[PDB]
């Protein structure tokens, strides 16, 4: 009785939200951006190749100096690289080898990693003893850690396979805010440039916009047909892009509360593992399971170029804060640095 | 290259040395992924041989690392294990169809196309008693069991009732039919019949792992 009445109201609310989005969907991004000139062919060469991992590389994260990066591999090694000289600054042995994500603190003093052990371990890179040691082990997630991102040296947001995201206080080791609302495993999260909002992608083919300070979901975005594996904010924070197993990339708008554009091709049938934007946001870079990385014209949904240099699935990619280069990881245990030439 | 760049590059190569040494030690053990249902009894198989439960046992001075995770996403982590130990309860006819669909998802997984499965049809003592009692009929759940006859090439164990042998060969055939339905030889299933007191489970894994590695070498030597 009461349950039957309530579930009908929820369906009405879904129709209310759906009708509102169509009301503001006056035009399409393709119609708006049909006039602008195409970016041409984007040719990026492999400037560096980072060798030294002895298993599949799961995640990589650039440092804010656009020179250092951290990569996580299932050989139990968290390796910090000097991308300019390919030198290995640090090699962090992990207690559990099933690491699935890695984070680099924007200050550069810490790195974080986590996997099937349901722990987000914090490592101190600046110690008086000259070695990297574990500073905090963040326990409390009942599922595998799929993503983690630093806000500062004391705040980190982690997404887990238990369908919940969390905000942690590193000093106390306790989660200040717990984010609930996803019905599937949360696979990725992208912090906004102001670090007050963050979008998360889950296996329920939905992307949720979260308020870090408030602690509740503000908006929900749908349209994907399978699990969302990668999510990335637009440079200005008014939009984001997702990559799912349905071989499509979608550009969702926060204010319009609806999808703006889909990046798909008939030849592409494999899942999408990682997505990132260039410095200006004109180019969308997506890693696929066909071992390639496609460069998309984010405003025109045209494939501008291909980064085909890996012999296994492209598991991750990232763009430096200065936008000079893009690093792509893969299951062939190799990282490549790409940029264009005049 | 400055004076400190050289000392940094020397540090990198020392790190490279310890990375390769740790990889060599990592390859000295064979990694096994343990899977099964709640009623499988895979823990008893582990304990007799002996959120992630890990067990180490040695067979002929060869070390095995078996991971019992306590799933389409995190299963990709075990993309490069030697074998998957899928344990089922053959006595439970009600949940046999759960195992068959569970086995099919693992077998047809896109990231497990080259991983061989060591199937352990556990609890054969319970299966033998259940068939002897006759209270429950496999034909009730599987209609094709009525028209199924034991092949003339079968080799039942000595002193085994033909009713038990017919039931065992049908249960095994259901899993094998899934395995041979697809794969084209990229991976092989290794069914075995174990009980709650069998002490040869570790050696069966060792003998099956040799064939899994041997098939891996034959692809390298041939698929050049």
């Amino acid at each position: 009785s009461e349950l039957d009445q309530l579930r009908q109201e929820a369906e009405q609310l879904k129709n209310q939200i759906r009708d509102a989005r169509k009301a503001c969907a006056d035009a399409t991004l393709s119609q708006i951006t049909n006039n602008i000139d195409p970016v041409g062919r984007i040719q990026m060469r492999t400037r560096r190749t980072l060798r030294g991992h002895l298993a599949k590389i799961y995640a990589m994260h650039w440092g804010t100096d656009s020179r250092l990066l951290v990569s996580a591999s299932q050989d139990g090694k968290l390796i910090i690289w000097d991308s300019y000289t390919t030198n290995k600054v640090h090699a962090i042995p992990l207690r559990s080898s099933w690491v699935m994500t890695c984070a680099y603190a924007p200050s550069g003093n810490y790195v974080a990693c986590g996997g099937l052990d349901n722990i987000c371990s914090i490592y101190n890179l600046k110690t008086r003893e000259g070695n990297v040691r574990v500073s905090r082990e963040l326990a409390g997630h009942t599922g595998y850690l799929s993503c983690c991102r630093f806000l500062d040296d004391n705040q980190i947001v982690t997404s887990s396979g238990d369908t919940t995201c969390a905000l942690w206080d590193i000093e106390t080791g306790q989660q200040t805010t717990t984010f609930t609302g996803h019905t599937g495993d949360v696979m990725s999260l992208s912090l906004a440039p102001d670090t007050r909002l963050f979008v998360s992608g889950a296996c329920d083919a939905s992307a949720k916009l979260w308020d870090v300070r408030e602690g509740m979901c503000r908006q929900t975005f749908t349209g994907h047909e399978s699990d969302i594996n990668a999510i990335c904010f637009f440079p200005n924070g008014n939009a984001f892009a997702t990559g799912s197993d349905d071989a499509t990339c979608r550009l969702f708008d926060l204010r319009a509360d609806q999808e703006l554009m889909t990046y798909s091709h008939d030849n592409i049938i494999c899942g999408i593992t990682s997505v990132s934007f260039s410095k200006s946001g004109r180019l969308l870079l997506a890693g696929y399971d066909d071992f390639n990385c496609n460069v998309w014209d984010a405003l025109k949904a045209d494939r501008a170029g291909v980064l085909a240099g890996h012999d296994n699935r492209v598991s991750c990619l990232g763009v430096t804060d200065d936008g000079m280069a893009v690093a792509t990881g893969s299951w062939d245990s190799f990282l490549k640095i790409w940029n264009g030439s005049s | 290259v400055s004076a400190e760049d050289k000392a940094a590059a020397e540090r990198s190569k020392m790190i490279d040395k310890n990375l390769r040494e740790d990889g060599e030690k990592a390859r000295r053990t064979l990694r096994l992924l343990l899977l099964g249902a709640d009623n499988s009894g895979k823990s008893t198989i582990v304990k007799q041989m002996r959120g992630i439960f890990e067990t180490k046992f040695q067979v002929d001075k060869v070390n095995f690392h078996m991971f019992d995770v306590g799933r389409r996403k995190w299963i990709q982590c075990f993309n490069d294990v030697t074998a998957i130990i899928f344990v089922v309860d053959s006595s439970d006819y009600n949940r046999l169809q759960e195992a068959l669909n569970d086995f099919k998802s693992i077998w047809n997984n896109r990231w497990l196309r080259t991983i061989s499965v060591i199937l352990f049809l556990n609890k054969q003592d319970l299966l033998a008693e259940k068939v002897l009692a006759g209270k429950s009929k496999i034909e009730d759940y599987f209609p094709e069991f009525a028209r199924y006859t034991t092949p003339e090439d079968a080799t039942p164990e000595p002193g085994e009732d033909p009713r038990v042998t017919r039931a065992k060969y049908f249960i095994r055939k259901e899993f094998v039919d899934i395995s041979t339905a697809s794969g084209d030889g990229r991976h092989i299933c290794y069914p075995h019949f174990t009980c709650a007191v069998d002490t040869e489970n570790a050696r069966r894994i060792f003998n099956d792992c040799k064939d899994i590695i041997l098939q891996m070498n034959l692809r390298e030597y041939n698929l050049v």
Partner: single-chain antibody, 230 residues
């Protein structure tokens, strides 16, 4: 972090003496080690350097062929075997650690030092002494014969402060970066062959001798030393 030196003492000319440096409180095997001596009423002089893992060794020309530097990582001890000792070898020998990677701080820690008694790029610090008062900004200048700015963008200049009766302390590394544990009032600036160290709001603890060292290439050469006195 601790570095205790032992084995020094009075020796006859032409003899041999063994210096031991016990390391504790840090990962000794990961740090390259240096020996730096300071002759009585004189400046600092780099002697030898053994890299991490003992794979690389450098010696000063004044000691090459006569001194032997070695480390015992399991025992966390650094050794300096000295042979054919001259009267010029009478000094205080300091055990100095340095780790080299991107963004690291070499020469971050100095040992207490041991007393031994026996019976190239030039760094110029023209002003040996400077009269100073508390609360007043003090600037110290350094010069180099060769341009310390390398092609990789780094300018390898290091600043050290030796308070009277204590070991030298690293202030600035690579000419601009403030060392950990150093008050923010210290600041370094320079370009090419000329560099400056600024000490805003000078205090009593700032009294000491300031040396500028180059790390562009071996051998490592210090400055003459600038003394701040009240």
């Amino acid at each position: 972090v601790q570095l205790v030196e032992s084995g020094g003492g009075l020796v006859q000319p032409g003899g041999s003496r063994k210096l031991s440096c016990s390391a504790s409180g840090f990962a000794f095997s990961s740090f390259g080690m240096h020996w730096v001596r300071q002759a009585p009423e004189k400046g600092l002089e780099w002697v030898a350097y053994i890299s991490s893992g003992s794979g690389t060794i450098y010696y000063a020309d004044t000691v090459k062929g006569r001194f032997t530097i070695s480390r015992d990582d399991p025992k966390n001890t650094l050794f300096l075997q000295m042979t054919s000792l001259r009267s010029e070898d009478t000094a205080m020998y300091y055990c100095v650690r340095s780790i080299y990677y991107y963004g690291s701080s070499p020469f971050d820690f100095w040992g207490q030092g041991t007393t031994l008694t026996v019976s190239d790029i030039v760094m110029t610090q023209a002003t040996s002494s400077v009269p100073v008062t508390p609360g007043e900004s003090v600037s110290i200048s350094c010069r180099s014969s060769k341009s310390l700015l390398h092609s990789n963008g780094n300018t390898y200049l290091y600043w050290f402060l030796q308070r009277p009766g204590q070991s030298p302390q690293l202030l600035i590394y690579r000419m601009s970066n403030l060392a950990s544990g150093v008050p923010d009032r210290f600041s370094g600036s320079g370009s090419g062959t000329a560099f400056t160290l600024t000490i805003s709001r000078l205090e009593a603890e700032d009294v000491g001798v300031y040396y500028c060292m180059q790390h562009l290439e071996y051998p490592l050469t210090f400055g003459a030393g600038t003394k701040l006195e009240l």
